[PDB]
């Protein structure tokens, strides 16, 4: 005889039908099907890749992603005037949205509902996300001047929403294997919990992703002009390391303030931040690199060049910047370890409604 198979579908598995035929060239053995699978392990966003285009192409492509946005973007300008998509396609930053925030009917549900009533707990109990929203007073006006499709107040709504859609299409066309590895990062985590075996409401998903958004901003009220003694950097060892600074850092906190952000890999680490921690720490690692390994008598060391150039630059200005040479700075205004006494009250008392139950 002689039979032959070829991939052909999904359903969750894969399909693989095949035919076998007589040496006479007859149709015997007939049909077939199969349903194999592979050792999956999906992942997620990087809360810092986002940009103009953003899988819009897809948008028109599959009815899948289709309504994903629709709902979100709809429920959006619906609950909180303005549309993600809009912001996703083009970057209307600059004197970005401000909403005419109708002072009629649709006013309240916006210029009140959800907005103003916003509450973060970085400091004190009731700090309603930037006042101004005051009673009547029409029109707020978010606005960066280099790409509002960031400010991580939006970045999230998108990069999030983005993957979601992307997902749908998948299991839609049947590609996701029941048993898989949910993966995240910063926000990239919802980029699974949200997707893969649902949890929240397609809708509400962003509602919070967004909430967590603003929240991740008014916890460190600083420079009522435009900035803060905050941000962060990342770094890769330069001659022997590992945990290398887990304390070379944790030995600066003994005199100033800062923790290790995320720690993606041995030759690459996310450094949370406290201004004079950068221009203050940098030199530290920057001097060790003057070719000096790891040996000798321990204990009576460190805190040397630390308190040397640390209490040297922390006063080298007021609201300085950053530098280079092993360890490059990021471009934000917050962290993920310092907040601490900001948890619960927001992303948790909020995580409550939307997430929990069923």
Short mmCIF file of C-alpha atoms in Angstrom, two decimals, residues 59-350:
data_model
loop_
_atom_site.label_atom_id
_atom_site.label_comp_id
_atom_site.label_asym_id
_atom_site.label_seq_id
_atom_site.Cartn_x
_atom_site.Cartn_y
_atom_site.Cartn_z
CA UNK A 59 -7.89 45.50 12.90
CA UNK A 60 -9.51 45.33 9.47
CA UNK A 61 -8.25 41.76 8.90
CA UNK A 62 -10.17 39.54 11.38
CA UNK A 63 -13.55 40.16 13.00
CA UNK A 64 -11.68 38.71 15.94
CA UNK A 65 -9.51 41.58 17.08
CA UNK A 66 -12.22 43.63 15.40
CA UNK A 67 -14.74 44.02 18.22
CA UNK A 68 -11.96 43.66 20.80
CA UNK A 69 -11.07 47.28 20.18
CA UNK A 70 -14.55 48.40 19.20
CA UNK A 71 -15.81 47.38 22.61
CA UNK A 72 -12.85 48.97 24.41
CA UNK A 73 -12.56 52.06 22.26
CA UNK A 74 -16.34 52.27 22.26
CA UNK A 75 -16.87 51.75 25.99
CA UNK A 76 -14.02 54.21 26.21
CA UNK A 77 -15.07 57.48 24.62
CA UNK A 78 -18.37 56.19 26.01
CA UNK A 79 -17.33 56.03 29.68
CA UNK A 80 -14.43 58.37 29.36
CA UNK A 81 -14.65 60.47 26.18
CA UNK A 82 -11.84 59.92 23.65
CA UNK A 83 -10.92 56.74 21.75
CA UNK A 84 -7.97 54.38 22.20
CA UNK A 85 -7.89 53.49 18.52
CA UNK A 86 -7.77 57.17 17.70
CA UNK A 87 -4.76 57.44 20.00
CA UNK A 88 -3.38 54.18 18.69
CA UNK A 89 -3.54 54.96 14.97
CA UNK A 90 -2.27 58.53 15.09
CA UNK A 91 -0.53 60.01 18.15
CA UNK A 92 -2.71 63.09 18.84
CA UNK A 93 -0.40 64.04 21.69
CA UNK A 94 0.84 67.63 21.88
CA UNK A 95 -2.16 69.62 23.14
CA UNK A 96 -3.70 66.13 23.19
CA UNK A 97 -7.22 65.32 24.22
CA UNK A 98 -8.91 67.54 26.76
CA UNK A 99 -12.43 66.53 25.86
CA UNK A 100 -15.01 69.15 25.18
CA UNK A 101 -16.37 67.16 28.08
CA UNK A 102 -19.91 68.18 27.29
CA UNK A 103 -21.51 70.24 29.96
CA UNK A 104 -24.79 68.68 28.86
CA UNK A 105 -26.09 65.15 29.42
CA UNK A 106 -22.90 63.22 28.58
CA UNK A 107 -21.14 65.61 30.92
CA UNK A 108 -21.65 63.85 34.26
CA UNK A 109 -20.97 60.31 33.15
CA UNK A 110 -17.56 61.78 32.23
CA UNK A 111 -16.88 65.08 33.95
CA UNK A 112 -17.67 63.32 37.22
CA UNK A 113 -18.36 59.66 36.60
CA UNK A 114 -15.02 57.86 36.68
CA UNK A 115 -13.06 61.12 36.27
CA UNK A 116 -12.38 63.20 39.41
CA UNK A 117 -13.67 60.32 41.49
CA UNK A 118 -10.25 58.84 40.70
CA UNK A 119 -8.35 58.06 43.91
CA UNK A 120 -4.70 57.11 44.52
CA UNK A 121 -3.06 56.34 47.85
CA UNK A 122 0.65 57.01 47.35
CA UNK A 123 0.26 59.76 49.93
CA UNK A 124 -2.76 60.26 52.28
CA UNK A 125 -6.18 58.55 51.84
CA UNK A 126 -8.09 60.89 49.48
CA UNK A 127 -5.98 62.42 46.69
CA UNK A 128 -8.48 62.48 43.85
CA UNK A 129 -6.40 62.22 40.67
CA UNK A 130 -5.49 65.82 39.95
CA UNK A 131 -8.34 68.08 41.01
CA UNK A 132 -9.36 70.67 38.44
CA UNK A 133 -12.02 68.12 37.57
CA UNK A 134 -13.92 70.31 40.03
CA UNK A 135 -17.71 70.31 39.76
CA UNK A 136 -18.51 72.11 36.52
CA UNK A 137 -15.20 73.46 35.14
CA UNK A 138 -15.19 72.00 31.63
CA UNK A 139 -12.23 70.29 29.97
CA UNK A 140 -9.09 68.72 31.43
CA UNK A 141 -6.22 68.18 28.98
CA UNK A 142 -3.69 65.38 29.23
CA UNK A 143 -0.61 66.12 27.12
CA UNK A 144 3.01 65.15 26.61
CA UNK A 145 4.84 66.80 23.76
CA UNK A 146 6.63 63.87 22.22
CA UNK A 147 3.91 61.20 21.99
CA UNK A 148 0.89 60.89 24.31
CA UNK A 149 0.64 57.34 23.02
CA UNK A 150 2.78 56.83 26.10
CA UNK A 151 2.61 58.58 29.50
CA UNK A 152 1.93 54.93 30.44
CA UNK A 153 -1.51 56.35 31.17
CA UNK A 154 -2.42 55.25 27.71
CA UNK A 155 0.49 53.08 26.68
CA UNK A 156 -1.14 50.39 28.74
CA UNK A 157 -4.69 50.68 27.30
CA UNK A 158 -3.09 50.05 23.91
CA UNK A 159 -0.25 47.55 24.36
CA UNK A 160 -2.78 45.73 26.45
CA UNK A 161 -5.84 45.95 24.23
CA UNK A 162 -3.42 45.21 21.44
CA UNK A 163 -2.33 41.74 22.54
CA UNK A 164 -5.88 40.85 23.59
CA UNK A 165 -7.26 41.27 20.12
CA UNK A 166 -4.18 39.49 18.76
CA UNK A 167 -5.05 36.64 21.04
CA UNK A 168 -8.73 36.28 20.16
CA UNK A 169 -7.94 35.82 16.46
CA UNK A 170 -5.72 33.00 17.54
CA UNK A 171 -7.98 30.71 19.57
CA UNK A 172 -10.57 32.04 17.12
CA UNK A 173 -8.71 30.45 14.24
CA UNK A 174 -7.88 27.76 16.80
CA UNK A 175 -4.23 27.85 17.81
CA UNK A 176 -4.10 27.96 21.60
CA UNK A 177 -3.50 24.56 23.34
CA UNK A 178 -5.63 24.27 26.53
CA UNK A 179 -2.50 23.75 28.64
CA UNK A 180 -0.09 26.61 28.16
CA UNK A 181 2.23 28.96 29.99
CA UNK A 182 0.67 32.33 30.91
CA UNK A 183 3.36 35.04 30.90
CA UNK A 184 3.52 38.74 31.77
CA UNK A 185 5.65 41.77 32.57
CA UNK A 186 4.65 44.95 34.39
CA UNK A 187 1.32 45.02 32.56
CA UNK A 188 2.15 42.20 30.18
CA UNK A 189 0.74 40.02 32.88
CA UNK A 190 -2.86 40.92 32.09
CA UNK A 191 -1.64 40.05 28.61
CA UNK A 192 -2.59 36.54 29.59
CA UNK A 193 -4.69 36.58 32.75
CA UNK A 194 -6.81 39.02 30.75
CA UNK A 195 -6.55 36.79 27.68
CA UNK A 196 -5.82 33.03 27.98
CA UNK A 197 -8.80 31.55 29.82
CA UNK A 198 -10.51 34.92 30.46
CA UNK A 199 -10.82 36.58 33.84
CA UNK A 200 -12.11 40.12 33.61
CA UNK A 201 -14.42 41.82 31.17
CA UNK A 202 -13.00 42.58 27.75
CA UNK A 203 -14.48 45.96 28.58
CA UNK A 204 -13.40 46.54 32.15
CA UNK A 205 -9.99 45.08 31.32
CA UNK A 206 -8.76 48.40 30.01
CA UNK A 207 -10.92 50.30 32.50
CA UNK A 208 -8.35 49.19 35.08
CA UNK A 209 -5.30 48.81 32.92
CA UNK A 210 -6.14 52.47 32.54
CA UNK A 211 -6.85 52.93 36.25
CA UNK A 212 -3.54 51.34 37.14
CA UNK A 213 -2.40 53.82 34.55
CA UNK A 214 -3.19 57.21 36.09
CA UNK A 215 -2.55 55.68 39.52
CA UNK A 216 1.04 54.85 38.58
CA UNK A 217 1.47 58.60 38.22
CA UNK A 218 -0.02 60.69 41.04
CA UNK A 219 1.62 58.65 43.83
CA UNK A 220 4.84 60.67 43.54
CA UNK A 221 3.55 64.23 43.25
CA UNK A 222 6.72 66.12 42.29
CA UNK A 223 7.79 69.32 40.47
CA UNK A 224 4.45 71.03 39.79
CA UNK A 225 6.07 72.10 36.51
CA UNK A 226 6.87 68.85 34.72
CA UNK A 227 9.16 66.13 36.15
CA UNK A 228 10.29 64.31 39.29
CA UNK A 229 13.42 63.05 41.08
CA UNK A 230 12.40 59.68 39.64
CA UNK A 231 12.75 57.32 36.68
CA UNK A 232 15.03 54.27 36.31
CA UNK A 233 17.78 52.49 34.35
CA UNK A 234 19.02 49.03 33.42
CA UNK A 235 22.47 47.50 33.51
CA UNK A 236 24.73 44.64 32.44
CA UNK A 237 27.83 43.40 34.35
CA UNK A 238 31.26 44.57 33.23
CA UNK A 239 33.85 42.03 34.52
CA UNK A 240 32.52 39.34 36.95
CA UNK A 241 29.14 39.84 38.61
CA UNK A 242 25.80 38.18 39.50
CA UNK A 243 23.96 39.51 42.60
CA UNK A 244 27.03 41.67 41.96
CA UNK A 245 25.02 44.73 42.88
CA UNK A 246 22.07 43.01 44.53
CA UNK A 247 23.85 44.62 47.47
CA UNK A 248 26.31 46.99 45.76
CA UNK A 249 22.89 48.65 45.47
CA UNK A 250 21.34 47.31 48.66
CA UNK A 251 24.39 48.97 50.25
CA UNK A 252 23.38 52.44 49.02
CA UNK A 253 19.84 52.11 50.45
CA UNK A 254 21.66 51.98 53.78
CA UNK A 255 22.32 55.70 53.19
CA UNK A 256 19.80 57.03 50.61
CA UNK A 257 17.03 54.97 48.95
CA UNK A 258 16.40 52.49 46.07
CA UNK A 259 15.58 48.85 45.15
CA UNK A 260 16.14 46.53 42.14
CA UNK A 261 13.33 46.91 39.61
CA UNK A 262 12.77 43.85 37.49
CA UNK A 263 15.73 41.51 36.92
CA UNK A 264 15.32 40.08 33.40
CA UNK A 265 18.84 38.60 33.11
CA UNK A 266 22.46 38.36 34.39
CA UNK A 267 23.72 40.70 31.65
CA UNK A 268 20.69 43.02 31.95
CA UNK A 269 18.87 44.39 35.02
CA UNK A 270 15.96 46.79 35.60
CA UNK A 271 17.00 49.45 38.10
CA UNK A 272 14.13 51.19 39.99
CA UNK A 273 15.02 54.79 40.87
CA UNK A 274 15.49 57.72 43.26
CA UNK A 275 17.20 60.52 41.27
CA UNK A 276 20.48 60.99 43.17
CA UNK A 277 20.49 57.19 43.07
CA UNK A 278 21.48 57.30 39.40
CA UNK A 279 24.00 60.14 39.03
CA UNK A 280 24.80 59.13 42.58
CA UNK A 281 25.27 55.40 42.07
CA UNK A 282 26.47 55.31 38.47
CA UNK A 283 30.01 56.36 39.38
CA UNK A 284 30.17 53.44 41.86
CA UNK A 285 29.75 50.72 39.26
CA UNK A 286 31.56 53.10 36.91
CA UNK A 287 34.72 52.97 39.05
CA UNK A 288 34.74 49.24 39.86
CA UNK A 289 35.11 48.86 36.10
CA UNK A 290 38.56 50.42 36.39
CA UNK A 291 39.61 46.76 36.23
CA UNK A 292 39.18 45.34 39.77
CA UNK A 293 37.75 41.77 40.16
CA UNK A 294 36.64 39.95 43.36
CA UNK A 295 39.10 38.54 45.99
CA UNK A 296 40.64 39.52 49.43
CA UNK A 297 39.30 40.38 52.95
CA UNK A 298 35.54 41.07 53.22
CA UNK A 299 33.32 43.06 55.66
CA UNK A 300 35.43 46.24 56.04
CA UNK A 301 34.72 47.48 52.52
CA UNK A 302 32.01 49.09 50.38
CA UNK A 303 30.32 52.35 51.46
CA UNK A 304 33.72 53.62 50.23
CA UNK A 305 33.32 55.34 46.84
CA UNK A 306 29.62 54.98 47.63
CA UNK A 307 29.41 57.83 50.15
CA UNK A 308 32.32 59.30 48.10
CA UNK A 309 30.72 60.47 44.87
CA UNK A 310 27.16 59.74 46.13
CA UNK A 311 26.92 62.56 48.63
CA UNK A 312 28.89 64.37 45.89
CA UNK A 313 26.32 64.47 43.09
CA UNK A 314 23.13 64.36 45.19
CA UNK A 315 24.15 67.98 45.75
CA UNK A 316 25.67 68.44 42.29
CA UNK A 317 22.34 70.09 41.45
CA UNK A 318 18.60 69.91 42.30
CA UNK A 319 16.73 67.81 39.68
CA UNK A 320 19.63 66.41 37.59
CA UNK A 321 19.48 63.85 34.79
CA UNK A 322 21.50 60.72 33.96
CA UNK A 323 24.63 59.56 32.08
CA UNK A 324 26.15 56.57 30.22
CA UNK A 325 29.14 54.17 30.28
CA UNK A 326 27.62 50.83 31.39
CA UNK A 327 23.99 51.22 32.58
CA UNK A 328 21.65 53.37 30.45
CA UNK A 329 18.73 55.37 31.85
CA UNK A 330 15.08 54.76 30.90
CA UNK A 331 12.50 57.55 30.45
CA UNK A 332 9.62 57.70 32.98
CA UNK A 333 8.59 58.92 36.45
CA UNK A 334 7.89 56.12 39.01
CA UNK A 335 8.92 52.52 39.92
CA UNK A 336 7.73 49.19 41.44
CA UNK A 337 8.89 48.66 45.07
CA UNK A 338 8.70 52.22 46.41
CA UNK A 339 4.95 52.58 45.89
CA UNK A 340 4.32 49.87 48.51
CA UNK A 341 2.28 52.13 50.84
CA UNK A 342 0.07 52.90 47.84
CA UNK A 343 -1.12 49.36 47.15
CA UNK A 344 -4.50 48.03 48.30
CA UNK A 345 -6.35 51.37 48.21
CA UNK A 346 -6.14 51.53 44.40
CA UNK A 347 -5.11 48.63 42.10
CA UNK A 348 -6.51 46.36 44.85
CA UNK A 349 -9.71 48.08 46.03
CA UNK A 350 -10.15 48.52 42.29
#
